[PDB]
Structures are given as C-alpha cells and as structure tokens.
Design a protein around this ligand. Structure first.
Ligand code: FAD
Length: 430
C-alpha cells in the first residue's frame, strides 16, 4: 500500500533538483497535500558503481515513512560492512572502529537509492520533469517562479531550490576550496593476481571491508563490495595545478593519484591496489565549500535554499544527504502548518529550525577536516577515539521536533518570544 496524500493544501511548490533535498521535499510535500512539480536538468539518474554513500538513521526513519516497499527495494544494495580499519600515512595500524549508526543506517550506492526514490515518486503520481534546466529565478508579491530551458515560465506559491553546490539559486539569492577528490571503481580480477595488492581481498567473501589512510594532507579510503568482486576508493587531495590561461575542461589521470601518494612512507600497499584502476572508471572532482550563509530565504520570502546549495559539507561527517533530507522534510512540514496565507512564514520558520543544526555540522566538518589531514599523532596514540567515526544527530526526528516547536518558532519570527534550539547540543559544538 502506497501512502495516500493528505487533503490538498492549495499550496503549489516548485522543487529544483533530483538530488536528496529535491526528491525529499517533493515526496514529503506531495504526501502532505501540496501540489508539487520537480525540475531536473539531467535526462536520467546517473549510475556509478563507485559512488558509495552512508545515509544516517536520522534520514532512514524519514524515508521509511514514505513506503515499506523501499526497505525491501534497497536491501540488496546495502553493504554488510561493520568496521573501518584506520591507518596512518606510514601504513601503520591505528584502530578499527564501527561505522556510525550501529547498523541502523544505510551504506549503499547513490544512483541506486536515487533511482528507487525517483520511481517511488512516480508511483505516487508526482509531476517530475527531467531535461528541464532551471534558470532566471524571479519573485513577486504572492508568487515566485523560474524559467525552464529559457523558453517556459513557471509560477507557484514558493520555490525550493536543491540544485547542489553549483547553485545558480544561491548566486541569485545572494548576488555574490583548493581541495579535490579522486573517485574510482574497479573489478578485482586483475588485482587478485598481484601479490602486492591481493591483500585487500582478505575476508571479503564474508563481509565488505573498509580501509582508510590519513596523513600529510591526504586522505584515502578503499571499500570492497560484492564478496570482493568489486571495490571503490576515494582520495581527497590538494587540487591539481592548472596554468593561468589554461584549458577549461576536466581531467583525471591515475598517475596523478599515484604521484599524490608518492611522499607517503606507507605508499606501497595503497598504491599497489589503486594502480589497477582503469582510466574510464576514474574521476577527480573539486570539492566546493562555502561558509554559512546569512540566510537561506529570499527577500520576498518565497524562494528558499536547502541541501548543498545552502550548507555544503566537507565529506567527513556522513551527513550531507541526510541533512538535505531533513531540510526537505521540515520545509514541507512547515508549509502544511502555516497554510496558504503564510507561505513566507513557513519558510522563515523552517529556516530557523534547520540553520543551527546544519551549521553546527557544517562547521564541524571544517574542524574535523583539519584534524584528519594533519593529525596530532600524540593524542591519537594516547586515545585513538578521536579519529574514529552522536545520538543528538542520529537519534533525532526532525518531523516530530518540527511539530513540537512550530508555534514557538512562529512567535519567535514574529517577535512575540524567543526560540531555544534543542535540535543541537547545548553550547552547540560538533
Ligand atoms: C566525496 C563525497 C562524499 C560524500 N559522502 C556522503 C555520504 O557518505 N553521506 C552523505 O549523506 N552525504 C555525502 N556527501 C554529500 C552528499 O553527496 C550531498 O550532500 C547531497 O547530495 C546534497 O543533496 P542535494 O540534493 O542538495 O544536492 P545534489 O544531490 O547535488 O542534487 C542537486 C541536483 O540538482 C540538479 N541541478 C543542478 N542545477 C540545476 C539546474 N539549474 N536546474 C535543474 N537541476 C539542476 C543536479 O542535476 C543535481 O541533480 C558526500 C559528498 C562528497 C563530495
């Protein structure tokens, strides 16, 4: 049984992006009685066997309330990995630690989860328009909208922008890193013949294995999949040097990834593994980071940013997509409770509920990023608990929390009172 949406709220919503924030906002809004159209520029969900992601329990509980079929749909795509073996740049063992969530989260592939959420949204009857490039955001009194493919104008009660780190909505709302990440996937047939690399296949038939190396401004993670028949890895590094007046296209070579690891005294075993990567299965994406914004909401109050467009994280917290999902849920829940004649209030309300929680984690990823690239090996040796992968994040329910505080936040925005955020730790630090 697919959940039947609530009574029509009379609220039309334009959602930009088919990522985690956009699909979340669209599905939750539809089920809460809103009239949803989702606009995405790509023609199909991109499928990459190496794009592995961790969805935390705080987002899994939200996704589960959209249909029980999803748990049985993503199950064969969930990794059975339990621990990550941390090592230094000398290739010396630090510690094994559990992955976060105590097994209540989802360690799976991105495109296969997005495809399931895309199909579930279609079964619900949500108007999803692919191949629809959004630009030229605009806003008036009572309505806001976008231009699709520079030919079609759409207008609605509000526009929720989840167009990622490369957000044109952000630039329109505001008017205003040096790191990169190798990403790769491979089969292990050729690697199994190499005795300098075959070590990575140990114990893989029983359970997926994870190895991570930290040190000297470099991070490397290797993950086995499918009983050791496949693996994926990610290498965070300083961005490749390009000339002043240089070709504006992208590039990715395994030799640069290997050269990045050359200064490591323990380079042998990691390099012996990744050197079997085929060139067609390797990318090198620059990582975007921007400090917290002054606001996620436009002046008129009917255009709002969520997800990476609002709060891009350094990928060391495993909460980017989950926080985008929390964004989409609270926004949709707030619209339902404020009503047609208070759409700007709802988005002002969702902002002050979400901004502290996403900003603590945002700044927390910036602090943890320095510690994991240039660690104090004395403190690590004294207490290895620092390196290794919080109930106030994973045990939280943004939905019921939004219901608790809605009136309190409404009175806080209007000025009747104050709002004490309790979706973050007291004296909030990550
Ligand atoms: C290396 C790395 C590892 C990560 N690991 C994790 C992890 O383990 N767990 C986790 O939770 N998060 C992780 N993240 C973060 C996670 O990838 C993002 O936070 C999440 O995708 C953000 O959701 P989103 O919906 O905002 O953005 P996106 O997923 O980026 O979605 C935006 C969508 O908008 C579309 N779009 C863009 N512009 C337009 C336009 N003009 N018109 C129409 N459509 C447009 C794009 O096609 C894209 O489909 C990681 C990030 C990185 C870089």
């Amino acid at each position: 049984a697919l959940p039947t949406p609530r009574a029509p709220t009379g609220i039309s919503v334009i959602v930009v992006g088919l990522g985690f924030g956009g699909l979340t906002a669209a599905i939750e809004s539809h089920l809460r009685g809103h009239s949803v159209i989702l606009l995405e520029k790509v023609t199909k969900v991109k499928q990459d066997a190496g794009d592995a992601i961790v969805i935390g329990p705080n987002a899994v509980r939200l996704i589960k309330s959209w249909g029980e079929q999803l748990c049985e749909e993503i199950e064969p795509h969930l990794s059975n990995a339990t621990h990550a073996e941390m090592l230094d740049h000398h290739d010396r063992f630090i510690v094994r630690h559990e992955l976060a969530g105590r097994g209540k989260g989802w360690f799976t592939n991105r495109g296969r989860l997005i495809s399931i959420l895309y199909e579930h949204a279609r079964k619900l009857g949500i108007d999803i328009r692919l191949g629809s490039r959004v630009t030229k955001y605009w806003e008036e009194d009572g309505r806001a909208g976008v231009i699709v493919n520079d030919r079609e104008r759409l207008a609605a009660d509000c526009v929720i922008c989840a167009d990622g780190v490369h957000s044109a909505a952000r630039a329109w709302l505001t008017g205003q890193s040096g790191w990169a990440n190798f990403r790769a996937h491979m089969t292990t047939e050729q690697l199994a013949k190499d005795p300098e690399a075959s070590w990575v296949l140990q114990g893989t038939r029983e359970k997926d294995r994870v190895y991570v190396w930290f040190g000297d401004g470099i991070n490397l993670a290797i993950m086995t999949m499918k009983r050791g028949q496949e693996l994926a890895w990610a290498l965070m590094h300083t961005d490749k040097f390009n000339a002043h007046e240089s070709w504006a296209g992208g590039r990715a070579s395994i030799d640069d990834a290997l050269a990045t690891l050359s200064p490591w005294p323990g380079r042998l075993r990691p390099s012996s593994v990744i050197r079997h990567t085929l060139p067609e299965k390797l990318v090198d994406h620059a990582l975007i980071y921007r400090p917290p914004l002054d606001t996620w909401v436009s002046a008129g109050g009917r255009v709002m940013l969520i997800g990476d467009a609002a709060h891009p994280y350094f990928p060391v917290v495993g909460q980017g997509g989950s926080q985008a999902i929390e964004d989409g849920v609270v926004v949709a829940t707030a619209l339902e409770l404020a009503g047609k004649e208070n759409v700007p209030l709802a988005l002002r309300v969702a902002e002050k509920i979400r901004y502290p929680r996403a900003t603590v984690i945002q700044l927390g990823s910036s602090t943890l990023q320095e510690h994991l690239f240039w660690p104090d090996w004395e403190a690590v040796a004294k207490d290895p608990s620092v390196f290794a992968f919080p109930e106030w994040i994973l045990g939280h329910d943004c939905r019921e929390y939004t219901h608790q505080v809605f009136d309190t936040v409404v009175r806080a925005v209007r000025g009747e009172g104050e709002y004490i955020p309790r979706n973050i730790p007291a004296d909030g630090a990550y």
